Each structure stands twice: as C-alpha cells, then as structure tokens.
Amino acid sequence: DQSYDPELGARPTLIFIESVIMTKFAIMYLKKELVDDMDVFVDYNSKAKNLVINLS
Amino acid sequence: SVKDIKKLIEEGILDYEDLTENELRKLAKPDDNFYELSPYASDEKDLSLNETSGLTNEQLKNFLGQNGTYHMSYDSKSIDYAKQKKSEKKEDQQEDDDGFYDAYKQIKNSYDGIPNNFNHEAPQLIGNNYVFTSIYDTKENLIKFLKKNSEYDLYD
Amino acid sequence: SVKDIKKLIEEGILDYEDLTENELRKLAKPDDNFYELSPYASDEKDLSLNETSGLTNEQLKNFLGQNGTYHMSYDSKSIDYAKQKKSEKKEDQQEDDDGFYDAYKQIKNSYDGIPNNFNHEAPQLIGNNYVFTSIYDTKENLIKFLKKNSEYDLYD
C-alpha cells in the first residue's frame, strides 16, 4: 500500500523492498547488531510503522 | 479556545453543535498561513480561460437571433484551428494527460470557490457568513454544519 | 557640509532632523556621477512596452461601450499570437522565466520613478520638492524623513 502502482507494473514494489528493507539489512550487518546465524521475522507494528523482530 | 486545537478535538470528543459563536467565527477565518508571504505558483495550465474564444461577431449574433432555420451556431474557425495545431506532433503525452486528473482537481476547486492554480485559502458564502477553505483543508464538516443547522437560525 | 560626507555620519552620530535646509537640498540633488558621461545601456528586455498591444478598434470600442451582454472584452488575436510563437521558437531555445528576478527588480524601480534599464539617478516628487534616487542609492531613509516630518511644514 505504500508503493502500489499498477501502471509501472509492480517493479516499484520490489524497488521499495530492495531500497528500504534490504538496505536496513545491509547497514545493520556491517555494524554488529546482526549475527551470521539470526532468524529474521519482519512484522508491522500497527503504530504508523515497520519493525523487524530479530530472533535467534 | 484556540483556532488550531479545536479541529484536533472534533474527531475525538466534542461535536460541532457545542462550539461558541466566537469559536465558529474563528474556525471559518483563515489560518496563520494566510498573511504569510510566499510568491510561488506553478502549472499555469488552467481550464478557466479558453484559448479558442473570440469576440462577439454582431452579424452572426444578429443572424442567430432571428431563428433563421439555421444549422450551426458557433463560428468553428478557431476551434478547428486548435484541433489542427494539436494534431501537429502526435501527442505521445496528453492523449491521456490533461483530459484526466488535472481536470477533476480544478473542477472540484471551482465548487469550493477556489481558482485553479490557487494554493491558498479561499472564501465561499455559506448561509449568512463566509468560510475560508483551501485545497488542503477543505473544511467539509463545517460546510455540512453551516448549511444543515443554519437553515432557519443565525450564526456568525 | 559636503554632500558625500553627511551620509557617512547618518549611521554613526547625527539623525536627519538636525540638517540644514541647504544640506537637505544638497542631499536630494544628484551626485557627481550625474553629469559624468557614460553612453552604455544593456538588457533591453523591458516590461514597459507590450509587444502584444494594438490600436483602438473603434468598432469594438463602440460595441463594448453599449454593454451589449457580451462575453469577451479584448481582441485576443495578438495575445494568442505571442503565446504560439513562445511555444514554437522558444521550446527549441528552451523555457526562460524572466520573472524570477527581472520582473521584481523593474517593478521596484517603477515605485521609485526609475525607468527599467535606467542605471542613473532619477527624481520623484516627495511633498513639495524632488528627490533624486537611483537603483544603487535608494535614499530610503530620506523618503521616510520627507514624507513623515514634512506633512504639515515646508522644507526645501
């Protein structure tokens, strides 16, 4: 719903996956808040917002 | 009691019927963004002026007035001239812009008493007094209030 | 006592009320750059002349004067001609603004009695006498003096 555009053919939906969600996975991997063996469980907070609950 | 705070309470607790006369007057006045200077405007493609328009012919108007069993009213020179100059470059863009979103936005603004490129707050007479609305804050729940409840009685 | 030195003292020590009549007369006269020959002007894009303008029609003016329940006043031929030539030989040369700055400079000069490309010192009647101002030295603190204090009494 943040990037729905059928006229552009749902590539901006995947750019929004790559430019937002995957970029936070890349930044938080360099600084050591993500161990190599971590399970990731993305969930929306229903507080205007996204949060990823890290699990081990 | 302040202009800005009451509209944050209209969804939560209190309705529109219990406001003060000085509170209904204040909520219909423009905000503080009015009187704040900003010399910026854009998108000067307005549907208000017609480029195909021409003067009164005064010989055709004489001829159309006598009812003359005629077959066409308008002049059709300048409105075929605009059709020809539109076809000059096939319209890659505009075969479906300018027949869509920019039309319905400017039509809805003309129901609120707002000019087409006008980004600021605009009055419209509702009943006995004026209500300053804009594109951004349409104040639609006030217009429902001052039309319905203010049929018989007076509010300022 | 000299024309040039007094305006260097207006910020520092003395105000405008204590000047001599011959000092207020001298400070409103033009400087020594006036009478010095400099035959060069540039940027001949003035907002004073309108290229879209035309003669009085004398048949339209007869028709518009009788109030004629008409729908358009002006002629709209030369002002659509200038719109068409702007879109064709201009879109190659792409868009130009001419209002981001050249408009507001020439408007402020017209409030000071200065022509649009006029780089020299220009008079404007303030009260009873003239004050020669330019673009460079606007003499705004004198205009505040000779309007406010010279309402009732006379100064030369």
Add this chain to the structure above:
Amino acid sequence: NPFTKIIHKLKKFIRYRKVLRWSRMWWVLLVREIVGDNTIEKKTEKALREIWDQCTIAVYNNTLNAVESKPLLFLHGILNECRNNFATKLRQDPSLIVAKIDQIIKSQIYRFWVSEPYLKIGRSHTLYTHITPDAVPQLPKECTLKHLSSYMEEKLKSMESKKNIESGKYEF
C-alpha cells in the same frame, strides 16, 4: 428594434416548442451540474440560456429523428454544440462551464438526465416558459459531478501520493 425582438421571441414559440420543453429541462439540470447548491445568478442565466437555445435550434434543424422518439441523440448533439458554442464565446470561465461540459461528455453521466422521472416532463404538455428548477427533480448524489469529481480525488490521490518515496525516512 423592440418589434423585431418580439417576433423573434414569437418564432421560438410557433416552431421549436417541442425541443424547448426538452431543452430548458436539460438546461435546468445542467445549471445544477455546473453550480451544485450555490446561488445561481438569475440574470446571466438569460445570457446563457439564449446560447443554449441556439444550440438546440441548431441541432433540431439537423435531425430527422424525433426528440421524443430518440432523446439521447440530442443530448450528444446539444451538449457538444454548446461544448463548442461556450468555448468560442466565453473567454474566462470562473465557473468552468466549458470545462464541466467537457467532463459530462467524456464521462457520460448525462444519461441520468434522461430517466423515468425525467421522461415524464418532456412528454407532458408544458410550455418551455413553465419549466422551472422546481419542475426538474434533482439527480441523486452519485450523478452530480461533485460526487464523481470527489471520487476522482480518492482514486488518484490515494495513488498520486504513492508516487515516490523519501527512501530512508521509513524507519522500523
């Protein structure tokens, strides 16, 4: 000049009396679609009713079909005649008269002007004079341009706002 004014007011009554029943009726609906519950000027209707009457005079001389037999052929004929007759006359439209008749043609919401409450007035024997805004029942809200326009807010600006991103303002 007042005498010539009288006969050419009569010539819309001796002939053209059947169209101006359907014409003034489709104009009372059109003023409601253009304005939509704001105070209309009683004086410059008369400037624009004469242009709308000259649109229907111009269409009914071009049609072999009857008006009562096939009514929507005239709405496509009359509205497009005054989509251009207003465009060649009205320079400035503050109330957007050319612009709204553009969208009544392009969105085809003029089919509600010919309906079961509306076909009863045009068949009945009323002179054009007697057709008032009270005689014309109002369209439902879904058929005013307002509702349709507002329905084009919601669609576009739900998606126009989902045009692009601040790309990093979104935190979690």
Add this chain to the structure above:
Amino acid sequence: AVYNNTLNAVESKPLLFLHGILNECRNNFATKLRQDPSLIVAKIDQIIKSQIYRFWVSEPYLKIGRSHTLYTHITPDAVPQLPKECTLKHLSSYMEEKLK
C-alpha cells in the same frame, strides 16, 4: 465580460471573479496599453503569479461588497488600506532582498 460568463454568484464565491477579472484585464490592458511607464500589465502579472490578491477578499473587505452601497458611492476612502505586508511594494522589496 466576466459576470456574463459565470453562473456562480459574486457574493457566493468571490475569488473566482478575481481570477476571472484580473486575468481579463491582464490581457485587456496588454492589448490596449502599448507603453506602460507605471507597469500596469507587469504588476497584474505578478499579482496573479504570486496570489497576493487573496487579501483583497478578507474580513474587512467582505463587509463593503455585501453592504448596500451603489458603486458610485465607493471612493478610495471607503475601502480600507491593506497592511504593508500584503501589498505588492513590500512583496517586490522583500523579493529583491532575498534574491540579491
């Protein structure tokens, strides 16, 4: 020319007329006035382009247009002055301060 083109009332929606009238005389002055020493076409350009004509319709100004005064009675004294922050002269001065 504008009031014959509007079904809306003037008192009901006033700014539609300011956009209609000023643009009509933005061009009516342009087709008639060749030389503008007082820059009449040029200033009406910037009143449209900067939208500072919204102050011409305000709470002191909506009282005159509703009142029953004939147009011959309206003088420059009956119309109250705009504040200095609203006029074009301070708008044109504050612009040149910012851009220079």
Add this chain to the structure above:
Amino acid sequence: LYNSLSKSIIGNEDIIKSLSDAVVKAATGMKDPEKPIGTFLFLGPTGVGKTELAKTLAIELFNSKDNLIRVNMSEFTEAHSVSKITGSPPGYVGFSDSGQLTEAVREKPHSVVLFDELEKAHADVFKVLLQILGDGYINDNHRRNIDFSNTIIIMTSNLGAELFKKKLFFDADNSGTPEYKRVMEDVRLSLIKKCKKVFKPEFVNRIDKIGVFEPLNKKNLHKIVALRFKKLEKRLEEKNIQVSVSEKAIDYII
C-alpha cells in the same frame, strides 16, 4: 563513504543516502545477481555538480579516474549512432572492435559507467539502454556477455531549462520544511511524469532512484567556494600555495 562524499559534494544528501547504501549492499551479500548495482537518473537544473559525483566515486571507490568511463551522448545523438555503442554487426565495416563502450567495460568490470546527458539522444539509443539497466546480459557483436554487475550506472540529464527546477526557487531559503519539501515533490512527480512523455516509461522502471538536485543560491554557494579553495590547497602546494578565505572574500564572489 557517506561522510567522504559529504566532504567534496555538499547538497542533496538524500540522493547520497540512496547512493551510498547501494555500495553498502554491494559490499555485503545483499547483491542482486541480475540487476546492475547503483542505477540512477540524475535530473536537475543546469549548474549543479551532477556529473561531479561520478568523478568523486572514481576517486574514492576506485582510487582512479581510469574507472570513470565517460559516454559523450552528444556523439550519440543520431539514430545511426547506436551501433557505436555495441559495435558493428558481422559482415560490415569494422567488427574487429566490439564497440566503443562495450569493449571498455570488458577489461574493467569494477568501474562506474557515466552517461553524460541523456536529454540529447535518439530513442533508438534508449532501446539498448533498456537491457543495460535491466540485466548484465549485454551481448557483443561476437555475442559474449559483459559483466555490468558492480557497475554503478550514473545517468545525468538536465531538462533544467524546461520547467520545474527551471522555475527559479522563488524563495532562496535553505529549506522551508512546510514549503520547499512540499513543492519540490510536486515538481519531482512532474519530472517523473515528463519522463513518460519522453524516456518511454519502461526505462523508468529500470531506474533504482531518480534524484532531483536542489538548485544553488546564496546560502549553498557560500559553502561551496571554500572547498574549491581547499582544492587549490591540496593541488597547488609543493610549490607552496595555501589560500585562506574570509567573510568578505566569499561575499564578493556571490
């Protein structure tokens, strides 16, 4: 790298956030094996440092101007000029080289690929570019793949003259948040809308981040010029030049 780009280039850090994080995805396992990493569309007004970012990334991410690969699109304005990108097909004049651009990427796969000004090209040149931003499956005349993975494809084009940013920022304020932020996005949407007008919107989907650059004025221009004198400090010392700037030394220039 986000801090080092903020040194030499000042404005439009939100583009830099989209630019630097593409390198962050490349440095880790967050890599897209099909799409080339870091495709961008640099629209903006004339005069700002748009092509300057491709110079800084060659000096920083690759330590050499050799990894900067300029493409003079003024050479590629004709519809016949598109064969100069991919080389001449077999049986014709040439064919020994695989092309101007396509040969040079083959020996340096880790390099930025600058496209100078996409506003001046025939649309047939854009047709090859659909594959270029889309995949690394670009074939030569001998039909060998070219590795456009790890290539940052910077594509500046002006369109500055035409409209939006062309409208001169009316208020040369640094950033009015309730004003500048709102109006800029409205012009940027228009810029994207214009593309559908010309860049054939299939090409827009291949873009990872269209970035509108903010036009310079007195607040921004005051900050740029001292770093240009610091560029005179590094280059022109050893032969001993060490300049200094003042309050009046920048105000005299602006």
